[PDB]
Write a protein that binds this DNA or RNA. Structure first.
Length: 301
DNA sequence: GCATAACTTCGTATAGCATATGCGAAGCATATGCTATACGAAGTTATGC
């Protein structure tokens, strides 16, 4: 850590701006490179392309998915670039091995994953079960899913919306605004969000976040400044799934239960089942055209 | 005086997206950098008997 961290902080001085997600990632690549570089002693910072070739073969023998290795190589090249040295990716051999292992592991039959779809009928079932609920933290989850499906928002978008961010019409719909665009909400879940607001009492300042922590004994808490962590919002979907079905299987496979994208895929696939014109889908999601939309539509029943 | 529920901070793995190049000479298929989940685990503190 210390030596590598102090080295990387030279780049922090030289290149101070990144997403919190990027500079998290580069450090965790460098940890693994340094560890390997110790366990077979070679010079640690200035890369030798033959050593990169050894490293890429060592990773390929652990059978990591090709999307991982291409990222490790990317981060190494970023580090050389912003430090001010020739890029290891300039090596012909490095390219040759990358192409070879890419073809090999593709021929080995890997597939990209796709999340389980939160189709409309599951929402209707869980609503039919929880509609009678009065325990506060049930109400919260029932409202949350009601928005997170209908409005097609990304999980880290909906986590942000302040009560200031919401507009209301008496006897009608409710409208939501997100960073110059406005999105509109069905006359059902309006009643759920109204119930949540009126029972929890978060409305004392529009600057409060609409979603907030709730404690063991059923009393809510306000906050103007502390948001609910997305790691708990995934803990909503996974909990309600574990309420409708038994526990996850021990095979360790991923996407065995709903996650943040299960709403988007559920909505898109249901709209395709409704026979919508696909450009209307692309307009609703705002998605720049790439075949991921087709892949979500890949099959119906 | 200790046990518990519901949540917050780290870490090592993959998917999304915006932009750019070829190849061929019009259009877009494939390639490249950067940003964001999914999951298991360790750690926090308020309420309770």
């Amino acid at each position: 850590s210390d030596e590598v961290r102090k080295n990387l902080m030279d780049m922090f001085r030289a290149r101070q701006v990144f997403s919190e997600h990027t500079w998290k990632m580069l450090l965790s690549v460098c940890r693994s490179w340094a560890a390997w570089c110790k366990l077979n002693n070679r010079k640690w910072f200035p890369a030798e392309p033959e050593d990169v070739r050894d490293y890429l073969l060592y990773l390929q023998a652990r059978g990591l998915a090709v999307k991982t290795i291409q990222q490790h190589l990317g981060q190494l090249n970023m580090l050389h670039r912003r430090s001010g040295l020739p890029r290891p990716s300039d090596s012909n051999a490095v390219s040759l091995v990358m192409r070879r292992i890419r073809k090999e592991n593709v021929d080995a039959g890997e597939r990209a994953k796709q999340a389980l779809a939160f189709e409309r009928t599951d929402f209707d079932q869980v609503r039919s079960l929880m509609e009678n609920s009065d325990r506060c933290q049930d109400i919260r989850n029932l409202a949350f899913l009601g928005i997170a499906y209908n409005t097609l928002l990304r999980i880290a978008e909906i986590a942000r919306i302040r009560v200031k961010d919401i507009s209301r019409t008496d006897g009608g719909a409710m409208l939501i605004h997100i960073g110059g665009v406005e999105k509109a909400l069905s006359l059902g879940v309006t009643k759920l969000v109204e119930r949540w607001i009126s029972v929890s009492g978060v409305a004392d300042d529009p600057n409060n976040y609409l979603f907030c922590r709730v404690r063991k004994n059923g009393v809510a808490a306000p906050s103007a400044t502390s948001q609910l962590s997305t790691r708990a919002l995934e803990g909503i979907f996974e909990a309600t799934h574990r309420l409708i079905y038994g526990a996850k299987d021990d095979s360790g496979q991923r996407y065995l239960a709903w996650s943040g994208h299960s709403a988007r895929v559920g909505a898109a696939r249901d709209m395709a089942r409704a026979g919508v014109s696909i450009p209307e889908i692309m307009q609703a999601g705002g998605w720049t055209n790439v075949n991921i939309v087709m892949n979500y539509i890949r099959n119906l029943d």
